[PDB]
Design a protein around this ligand. Structure first.
Ligand code: MG
Ligand code: MG
Ligand code: MG
Ligand code: MG
Ligand code: MG
Ligand code: MG
Ligand code: MG
Ligand code: MG
Ligand code: MG
Ligand code: MG
Ligand code: MG
Ligand code: MG
Ligand code: MG
Ligand code: MG
Ligand code: MG
Ligand code: MG
Ligand code: MG
Ligand code: MG
Ligand code: MG
Ligand code: MG
Ligand code: MG
Ligand code: MG
Ligand code: MG
Ligand code: MG
Ligand code: MG
Ligand code: MG
Ligand code: MG
Ligand code: MG
Ligand code: MG
Ligand code: MG
Ligand code: MG
Ligand code: MG
Ligand code: MG
Ligand code: MG
Ligand code: MG
Ligand code: MG
Ligand code: MG
Ligand code: MG
Ligand code: MG
Ligand code: MG
Ligand code: MG
Ligand code: MG
Ligand code: ZN
Lengths: 145, 111, 42, 155, 102, 49, 116
RNA sequence: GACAAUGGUAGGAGAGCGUUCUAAGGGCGUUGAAGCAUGAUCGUAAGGACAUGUGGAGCGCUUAGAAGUGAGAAUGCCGGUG
RNA sequence: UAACUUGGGAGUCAGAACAUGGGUGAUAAGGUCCGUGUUCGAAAGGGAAACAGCCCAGACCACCAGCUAAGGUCCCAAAAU
RNA sequence: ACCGAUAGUGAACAGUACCGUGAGGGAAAGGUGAAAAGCACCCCGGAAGGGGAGUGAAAUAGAACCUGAAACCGUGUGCUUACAAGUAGUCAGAGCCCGUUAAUGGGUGAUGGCGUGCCUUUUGUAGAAUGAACCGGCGAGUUACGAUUUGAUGCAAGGUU
């Protein structure tokens, strides 16, 4: 227990990033954003505290699929009532609620713990080009790819 | 600055007694007396006698003014249990516990 | 019909959270300087 | 044991159907008041050793006394009447430790009576010498005749 | 300034005046020890060993020779009537860094 | 010697083995008898020959 | 002679209960369930004394990877470059340098790039 | 000092811890024994101390000897209490 | 680096999967009976999501050191977007 | 080198109480203090029971009386807890509260990693196979006489009663 640094709330500095989903692939963008949200890009990464940064995604409606995912990829949910299975295609979900599509992709890439839930709450997704968080002064972030 | 009274081996169950003691704990003496007088429970007259005995001890043994006293402590401990039986059907006998309480009241002037 | 497991002290006390009585509704009587139940006569 | 305890003849309850453990008698060992399993039973603890070994033990004890300067020979004992104080004076003059074994040739009643009340002093005869007595003593006070007899019999 | 030293099969980041705990060294309390396996020197001027910085030594003073907190090593195998309990107290040498020589 | 310093000859005495006194002796529980069968029983085992 | 049960049983059981301090409810009170938990605690502690070394190496590697990506390099490339350059600074020290002295870590990265 | 070995059920072998009693020796105790309670103490383990509180009269240690000598489970027995 | 002989003391005589040579069954069975090898049994650790019997590999104890095995390196989740 | 109140007689105070038509079965239950000096008197209370005052070395020795463990039941509160999925711990770890047999301290614990009790019996049990409500006490390779083998010791063509 010699010398390993540990981040805590006193020394954690969380930045605000903005990422454009225009012409990006859903899964690849999502994995990169999940890394940023969890703080894996920080030298001070500490697993039991949230060292990540806030991420805004600003062109969710122009996110892109490959292959035939628009009609063939199906999102299923169950209401916990008998026969209460419902489904919607990825294309229909992009047409109706693209913010939900991107948000659910990223949160499915995040861990399912209390910390993971809070880190996922750090994500703000908007279908169109504008976002309401000018007061946080977000900085443009380019996807590494 | 404190006076105590204890009624030991009262033939009432401690759970039942604690129901009323919880009403009176921490209150001023007159308020506790009124609560006990108007509380419709079996334990209330017994607790009232304990509280009156404590206030009398405060006045007579420690030169305390009875109008400035608070029920600092009020509790019921378990006493010895009377073991009894009730005949049930098919010749069996089922246990009956007639429990008892040690009721303690401590009044204080706050000094 | 019968308990499958014994009830822990924690569970029993959690259940007893609401098992309590209330101080009765009482008001002061003017002449005698005592207390009585509201809407009752001495 | 369970056979010796009083009562306990009958089966306490039927083998099956009551929901209780099966039992055969209220005097079983797991029962309070039951019989004891094994436990002490009367017996002698004495055992024998070859006679040559007994003699070697006696000689070993006496030789340990003779070494370590724990042996002293008196000319004679002249006690005509039993007098504890006079025997204590004799022991003090001989400058002996607390634990002394007094050895006489035969049963000397006045010496025995004089010495038998002093704590730590014990009196024996030549034939009465034994390893426990000799080893327990710190010093042996032996008469010349007793010493000669001891030499004669232990060879 | 700081240094990376190699002692007790491990590496320690040290600065002057810092207390360090290392695997037991062959030395007595109050003596001066010298770490001669310096891997790296930071601070105002950076020396990068390959593997060691030639001529770099770190001097330290042995404050204490002690034994670590007792650890009860207990294991068992369920249903096999097999278990083992042992005690362990790991020796350590506590030193204070005096000076770092680049 | 002395009664407070007795010593048996070297190798002349060995402590008896006590079975059925816990796992760590290696003779707890089944007390060296293995598991089940006629030879595990009190009084068990066939006559010699 | 008869040997009564005496006090040894209570003393031993009390030792177990004291070890069970802070456990939930009956587990810090009753000897049987306390003994079971304490046995589990020992087994867990043995296993976790082993697993903690892996955990901390994992953490150091994550941090080194982040610092390398800051310097436009992957962890694997950086470690290969350091090995080729002959630098034997371990992962704990590398992560601690990356956290504390960014300039020294930059120098190390430059050496690794040169070796490659 | 330099080399090697040390997962383990049935089971074999070895070394020890602790309990009661006895012998001898040496000690403690109303200026407070045993027991009980608490503690952040010590030993590789079984386990051993110390301090404080309670308690109010017995009890350690060394060597050896002897055993009604160690419980978590037996739908175990008795008692107490959930 | 064992092997054998003589004595003291045992436990074992319900086995299982996998691979392979075969019988039986139906080139059925997580079937059954034999040969051969391994592992489990009596073996923790890493891999195969979880998963006695498969793959890697045999835990004296401690470390917040390093190199590898099977298996892996977009995120969950260490390492190649 | 027998027991010490679940032991030792079933019975330390009983072949009683209790059970059975009867033969018969058959318990539980010891300890104030050196001395009763066993609490005058006052106060609340119908009493019971208390608080004082006294006796006593001591009354939390006040008769349900030596010591007074555990289960279990309460009162107070230092830390913590109402978005969270759990064999309850363990490893990592801030924050808050304390300060020791002074030790690289104690209590609590946001949050992260790992993690299906024990025993028995089984090829194999988290097992939805067995057993245990909890705590405490009691509860299972013993002894005698022979045999054999090994260690020890004495003597030795002798050894031993
Ligand atoms: Mg009837
Ligand atoms: Mg009989
Ligand atoms: Mg074994
Ligand atoms: Mg067992
Ligand atoms: Mg069996
Ligand atoms: Mg069998
Ligand atoms: Mg068998
Ligand atoms: Mg039989
Ligand atoms: Mg006795
Ligand atoms: Mg016992
Ligand atoms: Mg490793
Ligand atoms: Mg090994
Ligand atoms: Mg072994
Ligand atoms: Mg053996
Ligand atoms: Mg032994
Ligand atoms: Mg011993
Ligand atoms: Mg016994
Ligand atoms: Mg039981
Ligand atoms: Mg088969
Ligand atoms: Mg087949
Ligand atoms: Mg085969
Ligand atoms: Mg088996
Ligand atoms: Mg395995
Ligand atoms: Mg094997
Ligand atoms: Mg599978
Ligand atoms: Mg796994
Ligand atoms: Mg296994
Ligand atoms: Mg490598
Ligand atoms: Mg990664
Ligand atoms: Mg008693
Ligand atoms: Mg009796
Ligand atoms: Mg007392
Ligand atoms: Mg008492
Ligand atoms: Mg909350
Ligand atoms: Mg939520
Ligand atoms: Mg888990
Ligand atoms: Mg089966
Ligand atoms: Mg279940
Ligand atoms: Mg069965
Ligand atoms: Mg059951
Ligand atoms: Mg029990
Ligand atoms: Mg036999
Ligand atoms: Zn009125």
């Amino acid at each position: 227990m010699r010398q390993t640094f540990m981040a805590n709330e006193s020394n954690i500095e969380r930045k605000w990033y903005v990422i454009d989903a225009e012409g990006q692939t859903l899964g690849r963008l999502s994995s990169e954003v999940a890394s940023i949200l969890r703080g894996k890009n920080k030298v001070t990464y500490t697993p039991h505290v949230d060292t990540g940064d806030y991420v805004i995604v600003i062109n969710a409606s122009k996110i892109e699929f490959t292959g035939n995912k628009e009609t063939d990829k199906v999102y299923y949910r169950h209401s916990n009532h008998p026969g209460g299975i419902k489904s919607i295609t990825a294309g229909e979900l992009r047409r109706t609620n693209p913010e939900r599509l991107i948000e659910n992709s990223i949160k499915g890439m995040l861990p399912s713990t209390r910390l993971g839930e809070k880190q996922g709450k750090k994500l703000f997704v908007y279908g169109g080009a504008e976002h309401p968080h000018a007061a946080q002064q977000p900085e443009n972030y380019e996807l590494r790819g | 600055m404190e006076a105590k009274a204890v009624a030991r081996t009262i033939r009432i169950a401690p759970r039942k007694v604690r129901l009323v003691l919880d009403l009176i704990r921490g209150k001023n003496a007159a308020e506790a007396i009124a609560i006990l007088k108007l509380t419709n429970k079996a334990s209330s007259p017994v607790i009232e006698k304990v509280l009156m005995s404590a206030l009398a001890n405060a006045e007579h043994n420690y030169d305390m003014n009875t109008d400035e006293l608070v029920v600092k402590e009020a509790y019921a401990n378990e006493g010895p249990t009377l073991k009894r039986f009730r005949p049930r059907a098919q010749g069996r006998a089922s246990a009956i516990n007639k429990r008892t309480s040690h009721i303690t009241i401590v009044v204080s002037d706050g000094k | 019909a019968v308990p499958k497991r014994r009830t822990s002290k924690t569970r029993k006390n959690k259940r007893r959270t609401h098992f309590k009585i209330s101080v009765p509704g009482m008001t002061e009587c003017p002449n005698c300087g005592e207390y009585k139940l509201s809407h009752r006569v001495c | 044991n369970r056979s010796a305890v009083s009562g306990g003849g009958r089966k306490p309850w039927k083998q099956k159907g009551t929901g209780r453990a099966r039992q055969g008698t209220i005097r079983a060992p797991q029962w309070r008041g039951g019989g004891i399993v094994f436990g002490p039973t009367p017996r002698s603890y004495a055992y024998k050793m070859p006679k040559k070994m007994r003699r070697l033990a006696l000689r070993s004890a006496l030789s340990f006394k003779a070494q370590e300067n724990g042996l002293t020979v008196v000319d004679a004992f002249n006690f005509e009447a039993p007098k504890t104080k006079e025997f204590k004076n004799v022991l003090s003059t001989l400058e002996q430790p607390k634990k002394v074994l007094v050895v006489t040739e035969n049963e000397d009643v006045n010496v025995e009576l004089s010495a038998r009340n002093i704590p730590g002093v014990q009196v024996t005869t030549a034939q009465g010498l034994n390893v426990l007595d000799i080893t327990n003593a710190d010093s042996l006070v032996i008469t010349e005749a007793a010493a000669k007899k001891v030499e004669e019999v232990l060879g | 300034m700081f240094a990376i030293i190699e002692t007790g099969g491990k590496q320690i980041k040290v600065e002057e005046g810092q207390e360090i705990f290392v695997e037991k060294l062959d030395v007595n309390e109050g003596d001066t020890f010298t770490f001669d396996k310096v891997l790296f020197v930071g601070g105002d001027s950076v020396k990068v060993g390959a593997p060691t910085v030639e001529g770099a030594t770190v001097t330290a003073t042995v404050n204490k020779q002690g034994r670590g907190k007792k650890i009860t090593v207990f294991t068992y195998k369920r249903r096999k009537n097999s278990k083992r309990k042992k005690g362990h107290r790991q020796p350590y040498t506590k030193l204070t860094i005096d000076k770092i020589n680049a | 010697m002395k009664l407070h310093e007795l010593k048996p000859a070297e190798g002349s005495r060995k402590e008896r083995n006590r079975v059925g006194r816990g796992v760590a002796t290696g003779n707890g529980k089944t007390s060296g008898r293995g598991h089940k069968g006629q030879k595990a029983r009190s009084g068990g085992g066939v006559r010699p020959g | 002679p008869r040997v009564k049960g005496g006090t040894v049983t209570r003393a031993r059981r009390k030792k177990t209960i004291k070890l069970a301090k802070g456990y939930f409810g009956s587990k810090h009170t009753l000897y049987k369930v306390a003994k079971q938990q304490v046995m589990k605690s020992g087994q867990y502690a043995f296993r976790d004394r082993r697993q903690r070394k892996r955990d901390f190496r994992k953490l150091w590697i994550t941090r080194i990877n982040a610092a390398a990506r800051q310097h436009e390099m992957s962890y694997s490339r950086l470690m290969n470059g350091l090995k080729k350059a002959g630098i034997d600074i371990n992962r704990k020290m590398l992560s601690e340098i990356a956290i504390s002295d960014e300039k020294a870590f930059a120098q190390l990265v430059t050496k690794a790039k040169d070796a490659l």
